[PDB]
Design a protein around this ligand. Structure first.
Ligand SMILES: Cc1cc2nc3c(=O)[nH]c(=O)nc-3n(C[C@H](O)[C@H](O)[C@H](O)COP(=O)(O)OP(=O)(O)OC[C@H]3O[C@@H](n4cnc5c(N)ncnc54)[C@H](O)[C@@H]3O)c2cc1C
Ligand SMILES: Cc1cc2nc3c(=O)[nH]c(=O)nc-3n(C[C@H](O)[C@H](O)[C@H](O)COP(=O)(O)O)c2cc1C
Ligand code: SF4
Length: 661
């Protein structure tokens, strides 16, 4: 089935068992106090190595405290870092994966001041804790504080710190070393003409901008020797106006190859300061592969690997078969499913837990200096935790799950995996719940992969799925289970609005279930994520859509990474929006609003969608109580409205805790 993905490859002298690479992932799992590798990190990367990845890259480790850009970033500075690095490499290597250590000083994106650092020694001098760059400047992004200009001595010291970092990985058993020269971190800052305004030998011409990187590579190569795998990450496109051209990145890569033997090029898209789309659901698998083509026709000798929304085995298989890339590189697909390569090579892609590019647990949690998580994978950051271990139940119990939404299905899946006799009762004709409604939204197309995954799991695990079956007190009693799991989800709220009883008033459920005929003008009351995604579905159909929000902002519950994605779509679909509006009443011809400035305006509508929020659909739970079965639990939105991340996590936690005694 995936002959090309499962084909081996030589990276330097090292034979890699397949063409699947798990990319560097800072996750805030290392010791926040000192940058040491701890059990949370070890077990996280061990799961990717057990999952079958031919290559497993560590997260980018800082080379100096000023280069620390994440609260729990791994450190590559002191002798006290060595024991942890050895444990990490042992764990990856034992599984048969090629361990690769990444070196990443975050430069302009450093946040040492936020990590209890009040001063540091840099270039033999006492300095403040501010980020460093080739040129003293500010960021368009408020998360990044103004940087200080590195002295030539600090530059020389950082080259040596990179050599020492590579020495540290090699002495602790890592199979190779990766230089992170991307996305706006220190090296990328010297490479880009946007960040590098130096007039000495470290800036000006492209040759000078590349010097810091070249000297780092030359130094590492001399340190580790000729036989040791030296790989690197470099941008193919920075998506920065006034940055380097795509062709300049190729010239830099050519300078790299001429300086040292590069054993693998990982090619990347954008900077953290880039406004445009790079990693979102706006980009589909293969949307960036033309860049890999240009590197190949430019004559780059080293094998190439590429990630960046490559979440499909079929797309990667073709890309590798056609020689566009030599290795399928991935980060978020490996967060979502650490066993993706094992599934690809055993010919079961239907078992893949696909990353939907939600950017919640991964990007967003890491950037707000929180412990990384994953929406679709509740095990992320918990592989090391005994409370998340999946253990066979000795005494099989009869488990009745009410509701085939994500929380119900994840619970049923885990309870069946552990050996319980599981039944799902679902009132509609199909599984998915609100995920089955959301999949209709333009940016939620990868939610069909979540449906496909759970549909295939129910089948394989022998879960008794009872579709078109509304669970009642009587049908639960007839079933007589040992454990009743209520996972009936949420329902649209009914706020106290004048004229809410109008015929014009509908809800997000009736829209997505096709239970309402919509006109040419559709007006949404509510500016939350659910209201916006439904409005995008209504607008895609070529309808005139207005979103009215009483609060200060629309998309208020949408993480920073998805905000711009929604702006682009709303503009593209000619969607109108109003904020700080008072909803006065709903009537026959639309909705009467009063702006924050005092303007009374009539919003013309053929349909009024009241989408201010969701209530817990807890009628069944209130009707049956806690005594209808020996064990009664409520999970997901029926236990209190949260979102998809919490529903899936509640399901996993419910599924693992169902005891056998
Ligand atoms: C259009 C849309 C877009 C969304 N977008 C996002 C997003 O981007 N990110 C995010 O975090 N969240 C989003 N959400 C919310 C998210 O989908 C929900 O939080 C989540 O699906 C709730 O999971 P659940 O298992 O608790 O309930 P549900 O998904 O609501 O499932 C409940 C299930 O129980 C069934 N059922 C109900 N009563 C009975 C009964 N008595 N007997 C049998 N079956 C019954 C229902 O038919 C349904 O299948 C969105 C929701 C919608 C509708
Ligand atoms: C939480 C998170 C942390 C990341 N940490 C790193 C890092 O340590 N070093 C690095 O070079 N890239 C890092 N990246 C970039 C990824 O390795 C990857 O190239 C990117 O997410 C695009 O690939 P994908 O679509 O497979 O996720 C990070 C990405 C995420 C989601
Ligand atoms: S949190 Fe969302 S984007 Fe990140 S790995 Fe999980 S499914 Fe993918």
């Amino acid at each position: 089935m995936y002959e090309n993905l499962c084909k081996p490859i030589k990276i330097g002298n090292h034979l890699v068992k397949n063409r699947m690479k798990y990319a560097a992932t800072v996750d805030n799992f290392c010791d926040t106090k000192n940058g040491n590798v701890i059990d949370r990190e070890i077990e996280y990367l061990r799961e990717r190595a057990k999952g079958g990845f031919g290559i497993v890259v560590s997260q980018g480790g800082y080379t100096h405290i000023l280069g620390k850009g994440y609260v729990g970033q791994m450190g590559l500075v002191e002798e006290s870092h060595l024991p942890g690095l050895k444990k990490l490499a042992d764990a990856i290597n034992a599984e048969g994966a090629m361990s690769i250590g990444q070196i990443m000083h975050t430069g302009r994106y450093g946040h040492a001041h936020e990590y209890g650092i009040h001063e540091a020694i840099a270039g033999g001098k006492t300095v403040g804790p501010e980020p460093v760059g080739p040129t003293a400047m500010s960021s368009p992004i408020k998360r990044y504080s103004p940087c200080r200009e590195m002295t030539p001595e600090e530059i020389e010291e950082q080259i040596q710190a990179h050599i020492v970092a590579a020495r540290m990985f090699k002495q602790t058993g890592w199979k190779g070393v990766e230089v992170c020269a991307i996305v706006g971190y220190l090296i990328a800052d010297f490479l880009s003409r946007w960040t590098n305004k130096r007039t000495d030998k470290w800036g000006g011409s492209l040759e000078n901008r590349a010097r810091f990187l070249i000297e780092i590579l030359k130094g590492i190569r001399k340190e580790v020797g000729d036989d040791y795998p030296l790989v690197m990450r470099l941008n193919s496109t920075d998506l920065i106006e006034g940055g380097n051209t795509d062709e300049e990145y190729i010239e830099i890569a050519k300078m790299c190859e001429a300086a040292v033997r590069i054993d693998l090029f990982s090619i990347t898209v954008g900077w953290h300061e880039s406004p445009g789309a790079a990693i979102t659901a706006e980009k589909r698998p293969g949307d960036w592969l033309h860049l890999a083509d240009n590197w190949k026709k430019a004559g780059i000798k080293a094998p190439i690997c590429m990630a960046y929304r490559m979440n499909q085995p079929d797309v990667a298989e073709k890309a590798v078969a056609e020689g566009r890339i030599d290795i399928w590189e991935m980060c978020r697909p490996g967060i979502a499913d650490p066993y993706l390569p094992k599934k690809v090579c055993e010919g079961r892609p239907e078992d893949i837990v696909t990353c939907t590019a939600c950017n919640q647990g991964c990007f967003y949690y890491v950037f707000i200096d929180a412990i990384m998580g994953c929406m679709v994978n509740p095990r992320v950051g918990n592989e090391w935790d005994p409370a998340y271990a999946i253990n066979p139940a000795a005494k099989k119990k009869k488990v009745l799950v009410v509701g085939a939404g994500p929380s119900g299905m994840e619970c049923a899946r885990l309870a069946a995996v552990r050996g319980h006799d599981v039944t799902i009762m679902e009132k509609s004709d199909s599984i998915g719940g609100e995920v089955k409604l959301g999949v209709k939204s333009p940016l939620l197309y990868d939610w069909a992969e979540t449906i496909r995954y759970y549909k295939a799991q129910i089948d394989k695990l022998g879960i008794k799925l009872k579709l078109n079956t509304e669970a009642t007190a009587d049908s639960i009693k007839a079933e007589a289970p040992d454990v009743l799991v209520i996972a009936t989800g949420g329902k649209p709220s009914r706020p106290k609005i004048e004229g809410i009883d109008n015929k014009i008033v509908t809800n997000v459920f009736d829209i997505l279930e096709g239970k309402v005929k919509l006109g040419d003008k559709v007006v949404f009351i509510g500016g939350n994520e659910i209201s916006i995604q439904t409005a995008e579905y209504v607008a895609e159909q070529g309808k005139e859509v207005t979103v009215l929000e009483k609060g200060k902002h629309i998309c208020f519950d949408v993480n920073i990474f998805n905000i711009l994605q929604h702006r682009r779509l709303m503009a593209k679909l000619n969607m109108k929006s109003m904020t700080n509006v008072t909803i006065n009443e709903i009537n026959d011809d639309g909705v009467e609003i009063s702006t924050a400035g005092g303007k009374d305006v009539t919003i013309e509508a053929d349909n009024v969608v009241v989408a201010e929020g969701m209530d817990a659909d807890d009628a069944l739970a209130k009707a049956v109580g806690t005594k209808i079965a020996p064990e009664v639990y409520s999970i997901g939105d029926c236990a209190g409205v949260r979102k998809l991340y919490e529903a899936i996590h509640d399901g996993y936690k419910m599924g693992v805790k169902i005891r056998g005694s």
